[PDB]
Design a protein around this ligand. Structure first.
Ligand SMILES: NC(=O)C1=CN([C@@H]2O[C@H](COP(=O)(O)OP(=O)(O)OC[C@H]3O[C@@H](n4cnc5c(N)ncnc54)[C@H](O)[C@@H]3O)[C@@H](O)[C@H]2O)C=CC1
Ligand SMILES: NC(=O)C1=CN([C@@H]2O[C@H](COP(=O)(O)OP(=O)(O)OC[C@H]3O[C@@H](n4cnc5c(N)ncnc54)[C@H](O)[C@@H]3O)[C@@H](O)[C@H]2O)C=CC1
Lengths: 337, 335
């Protein structure tokens, strides 16, 4: 077989460094070889060279080759999947609206590169923040691609939730089931425990039937929400290994399918006629599985109580608002020209 | 199965960060769960805490639990294997004798902790520099353990050599065979291409028969020698992912055995009656394989020409010298 071509943007950063090695080690594509397209900006090219040197010094049997570059054509040409890690960080004094705005241009341009140069079968995982909206913008501006080509990463938050709940309950993570992260990232994200069950001593119960209401519907989202800050506080830098783990997990499931009973939160273009009353037009985190053909499906059968309904409606509203900001910013720049 | 207990020293550093995650992902012990013992020093507590939070945030099914601590006893208690990454760095104005001396204390103490608290079957991989001598010192001070419990990491250098020679030949790494790293780390390391072959267009030839003499016996060793430096110059930090890769490769082979035809350079206490005329009493990188019971063996059948003989003798002499420095320093401290 021919090697799979894999793009990583912002390749010289923390996440790119780990992600490239992990993929080159064979963890993503199994026995198949990989060819890495490694994209960054000119200031970062020395760091990027250092990365390629270490890749080389691993003598990876799965690594068919690589290109390290600042050129979009070289980075996107004939790729099979992409980890869009790079984004424009928040500048001092900026609010979220400005973050959405600055990134809208990057992701418009990236959608255009994808459509022009990537394989029609390309699987694009959006990681750089604001990821749901960056994904929507990239998709909207990729004329030869389709919704099925795009998703955004919410698995980091799901993994955080699983560990938090399992620890609280005093069980292993494998003994907790059906925790879901819905909607947008950021403040409106819905960390849903209302479906969740756990097994302890051969006894299976619902999480919300055992834990205090205060914990579930207050303390829990608080700990999840301040987790990244807490890591930065102690580390001096933001997370790197844990988003990488989640990214590989998402893509591997997307490529080859999920396991029986497995439910992974994934940001996807909202399907028309989804069973949870979400309006098409944005990228929204749903409970998902993936079939052996690599197609993502929203998992049916979960229940929406009044609390969840309100939270879903709020994060839906939030996502359409972000989209509006992004499209308006692009329209204003266009008008100015 | 009960969880395998895995120690990583210097856990809060760059290598420790990646190594802990890679192991927790299941890549070392397969289906068996792991329980990480993460040791570092007092000023690194916050970075260690940060590491544990990220491990937690991966929701690894292979991670049974962890201890993250500055306490020796908690870190070494009932461990099954150890990656000894931490070491005393060279301080400005110090020479190699100083580096050997400062680390001898640390590794004497580590040998004692290992003997006192680790399982008798513990597999100890020494990574922190100077690794051959650190390994020898820890072993000598591990009363209840044996030479079989100890090895040192030379696989990063072998992997570097394979990619260098493959790139020079314009072939795939898989098409190059029998490159070996012998002896000590540092200046006297022997990057041996005299056994090595490669395949291309249906022909197998010796590397030394095809590549230029100046390349093989000068340019090549210089390239391998200034590689770490060149990465530092570009990265702003020392290598991390590549030594982690080699360390997992080494330990996984040690745990389950090597594949057919596979030859891994490994630093081991010199076996009596090894076929390459090396004296017992130091830790020396040999071409090795590992049997299905996890026992390391020196590979037989390689040839020692006059060039290799001289290089082997020089690095051997170098190792016994380093050992002497370390033991003399420890002796001074006693009296
Ligand atoms: N969705 C999720 O679950 C999470 C996402 N993230 C996102 O990942 C991003 C990267 O994180 P780190 O790797 O820690 O950051 P980093 O600052 O270490 O590296 C970012 C890299 O992107 C590069 N870059 C900037 N603009 C670029 C462009 N137009 N094209 C290509 N490369 C470009 C930089 O040169 C740098 O090498 C963050 O900015 C954040 O948005 C971070 C954590 C979790
Ligand atoms: N054998 C090989 O192939 C290679 C070995 N190395 C070795 O790896 C070592 C560390 O590399 P990184 O982790 O990237 O360095 P780093 O500087 O990022 O972190 C080293 C860690 O060791 C800790 N440490 C220092 N003294 C300690 C003690 N007595 N007990 C416990 N922890 C202690 C530090 O607090 C620090 O967290 C180097 O000292 C070097 O000797 C590096 C490259 C290749």
């Amino acid at each position: 077989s021919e090697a799979a071509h894999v793009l990583i943007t912002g390749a010289a950063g923390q996440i790119g460094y780990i992600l490239s090695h992990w993929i080159a080690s064979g963890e993503l594509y199994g026995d198949r070889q990989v060819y890495l397209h490694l994209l960054d900006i000119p200031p970062a090219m020395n760091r990027l060279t250092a990365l390629t040197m270490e890749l080389e010094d691993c003598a990876f049997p799965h690594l068919a080759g690589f290109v390290a570059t600042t050129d979009p054509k070289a980075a996107f040409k004939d790729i099979d999947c992409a980890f869009l890690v790079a984004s424009m960080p928040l500048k001092p004094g900026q609010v979220r609206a400005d973050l959405i705005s600055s990134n809208s241009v990057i992701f418009k341009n990236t959608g255009e590169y994808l459509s022009k140069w990537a394989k029609p079968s390309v699987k694009v995982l959006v990681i750089g923040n604001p990821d749901n909206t960056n994904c929507e913008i990239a998709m909207l501006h990729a004329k030869n691609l389709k919704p099925e080509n795009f998703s955004s990463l919410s698995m980091l938050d799901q993994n955080r939730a699983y560990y938090e709940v399992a620890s609280k309950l005093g069980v292993d993570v494998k003994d907790v089931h059906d925790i879901i992260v819905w909607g947008n990232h950021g403040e409106s994200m819905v960390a849903d425990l209302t479906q969740a069950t756990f097994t302890k001593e051969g006894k299976t119960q619902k999480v919300v039937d055992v834990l205090d209401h205060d914990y579930v519907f207050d303390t829990f989202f608080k700990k999840i929400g301040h987790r990244a800050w807490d890591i930065l506080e102690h580390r001096g830098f933001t997370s790197a290994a844990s988003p990488t783990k989640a990214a590989i997990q998402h893509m591997k499931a997307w490529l080859f399918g999920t396991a029986p009973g497995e439910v992974l939160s994934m940001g996807i273009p909202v399907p028309e006629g989804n069973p949870y009353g979400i309006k098409p037009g944005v990228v929204f985190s749903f409970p998902c599985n993936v079939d052996k053909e690599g197609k993502i499906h929203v998992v049916e059968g979960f229940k929406v109580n009044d609390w969840l309904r309100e939270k879903l409606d709020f994060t839906e509203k939030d996502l359409f608002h972000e989209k509006e900001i992004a499209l308006n910013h692009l329209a204003q720049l266009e008008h100015h020209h």
